[model samples]
Target: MPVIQTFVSTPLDHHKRENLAQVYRAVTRDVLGKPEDLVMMTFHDSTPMHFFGSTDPVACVRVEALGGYGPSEPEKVTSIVTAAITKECGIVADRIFVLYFSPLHCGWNGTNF
Candidate 1:
């Protein structure tokens, strides 16, 4: 399973959240080869974030998965996600940042996987 967290400075409404969830799910599927059903997404909106000394629209994303992540994956994901965010959230690509983490294991429900 993969969990994607997107932190954005812009406040999100129900419509925005639903739209972002779709973007995240497609991005995760393409980048990590995960199915939509196995992916999880969350958005932290209205976060106090700054870049280049200004508080403009921006996003910081964290994608956590169970192992097997490689160096090139984030680069690929960044390009796609940046485009998605720019289109959906009106946040420019330069204002967005993405980070990835993969460990040997992750726990869900009552068990570790």
Candidate 2:
């Protein structure tokens, strides 16, 4: 199981959010090799976020999975997902930051996965 999340300085409208979700879903399916129908996504827009001590366009992406990302896998994922953020949200590649995590414990409806 995996969850994809996006947080950015840009404000996304409903249409953009849907497109971003679709992009993230593809990343989960094609890049992460996770089940296409089993994924979670969240968005945080127009965040009070700053980079380089300035409030220009920036994006922070997070991906948490049951199994951790391997060495080369993270490199590939970061490249693709960061580019997704830039394309959908108008943030520059240089201003985007990403975080990846493998949780020791993650829960679902009535059980842990």
Candidate 3:
């Protein structure tokens, strides 16, 4: 399996959460060729005062999703996700991580949620 995690520097709110979930589901399906049930996603919103980033400074939401994706697809996913956030949540395009990684060095298992 492949996992994609991101540190979103956005605030925690109902709209933001819903927007993130929507973007995750849409992107996962469009990019990975799977349903939303196949992957797991989470979001963590932090206050600007509490955000700890030296260079970029994070004061927004942190989102992380675990699944499978090739390196070539993250750009598309990021574009779609960013568009959603920008259109729905009013978050700046550069405030998100959209980070992708390979699963070769990682491991995960399904458990009760």
C-alpha lDDT values of all predictions: 0.84, 0.85, 0.56
Return the TM-score for each candidate structure: 0.88, 0.92, 0.62
The positional error of residue 41 in candidate 3, measured at the CA in angstroms, is 1.0
The runs of at least 3 residues in candidate 1 whose Cα sits more than 4 Å from the true structure, single-residue gaps closed, are: none
lDDT by residue (20-57, candidate 2, tens digit) is 88887787778888876777988888898878989999
Which candidate number has the best TM-score?
A: 2
TM-score-best of 1 and 2? 2
Report RMSD (Å) for each prediction in the order shown.
Answer: 1.6, 1.2, 4.9
Query: Which regions in candidate 2 have their CA more than 4 angstroms from the true location?
Result: none
Off by over 4 Å in 3: 1-6, 47-68, 105-113
Count backbone overlaps in model 3: 8
Best by lDDT: 2
Where is model 2 poorest over a 10-residue stretch in terms of lDDT? 67-76
Worst 10-residue lDDT window for candidate 1 reads: 67-76
Q: How badly does each model clash, as a count of residue pairs?
A: 0, 0, 8
